[PDB]
Amino acid sequence: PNNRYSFIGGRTGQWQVVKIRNVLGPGLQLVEKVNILNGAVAEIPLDSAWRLQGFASNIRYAIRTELEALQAVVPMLNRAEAILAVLIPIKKSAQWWEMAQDERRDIFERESHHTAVGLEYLPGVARRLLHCRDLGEEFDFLTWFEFAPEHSSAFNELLLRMRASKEWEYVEREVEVWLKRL
Amino acid sequence: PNNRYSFIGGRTGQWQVVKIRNVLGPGLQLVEKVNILNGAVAEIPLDSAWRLQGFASNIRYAIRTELEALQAVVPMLNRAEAILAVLIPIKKSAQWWEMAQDERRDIFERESHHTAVGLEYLPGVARRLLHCRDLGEEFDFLTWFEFAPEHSSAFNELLLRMRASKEWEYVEREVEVWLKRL
């Protein structure tokens, strides 16, 4: 449908905030709930603390054989069992964005094995990647993960592996918003 | 800095329309002038026939050696002598966008030599690429070229070569707006 998603932190919404972890750089204000809208929001209610937005876009790095591997195991969003979610806004450094395409692909997969590592956690973890640097937002990406509680430990292990990678040496802001489906 | 540009076809603007060539698919209404703004415009003005918008973004295909060659030879915009320009909005097919990154890169450069051929013409041609598929626009890209009249025949030769390329088999809408500086 609409390629735009808005995440409004405040007092209403479909998701309850469990905790907010300020991984790197300035964090996000603590709020009660997150309201997720499949569209752009002009202004947020007075009782909202922040608004995040991003759009779904085309593939930027993954190659055909990687997409085939993902498609064989990828789970759908909105599984009945997937009552936990994590929203992770990420900003990468200017030095990352000034690099050419071969340099960034080399770091993303040849050195960091982003997709190969991520594949190990499917189909337990469902995901949605949104882009927002081109919208002028404070973050460059909004990443969304959801899973049943049984996979919480596996997801924490994934996070540890990702943040140890060469790719994460270019991450300059990151926040984790942990959520429970209402 | 603002990464957004709007092109408004209508009665006023910095560029006078010389001709519009509706190359492929639905065309653009003939107008007297094109007004170019470095920002977003909420609505299409009353006296305007169309409003196109796009954003400047990061590199998607060019590799380091290609980028070095491009950045070293491309002219600046708004040269005294560059009184001719061409605005070429382009839309690619759904089949293009569903391909993986290696598939699209291979078509763009390996099979079509987009950058290698373009570099032959770039010394006299200033260029700006803007993206707009992610904005929900009716085109996917807005391409902008400007040059002195002495290079008109060379630019037409470049267009002849690119429209014969494998990449152009995926172009499904294309309009040429030829302009003269006011």
Ligand code: HEM
């Ligand atoms: C759960 C398993 C995961 C899988 C299968 C996975 C897969 C992928 C793939 C294939 C891409 C590239 C999309 C493209 O080519 O445009 C990507 C991009 C990205 N992923 Fe993941 N990912 C996973 C987990 C994560 C996690 C846990 C994070 C953050 C903590 C994350 C952050 C990102 C970011 C920021 C990008 C954008 C990279 C860029 O364009 O520079 N991913 N992911």
Ligand code: HEM
């Ligand atoms: C004048 C010499 C030219 C040069 C040096 C050149 C170079 C380039 C480069 C390097 C890119 C890739 C940017 C990136 O990696 O993200 C690109 C993209 C593009 N160019 Fe050109 N170009 C030229 C002429 C043209 C012309 C005449 C047209 C249209 C008739 C055109 C249409 C496009 C389009 C539509 C894209 C976007 C491709 C995509 O992302 O799928 N270019 N050009």
Ligand SMILES: O=N[O-]
């Ligand atoms: O792979 N980030 O949703």
Ligand SMILES: O=N[O-]
């Ligand atoms: O290369 N199109 O600006």
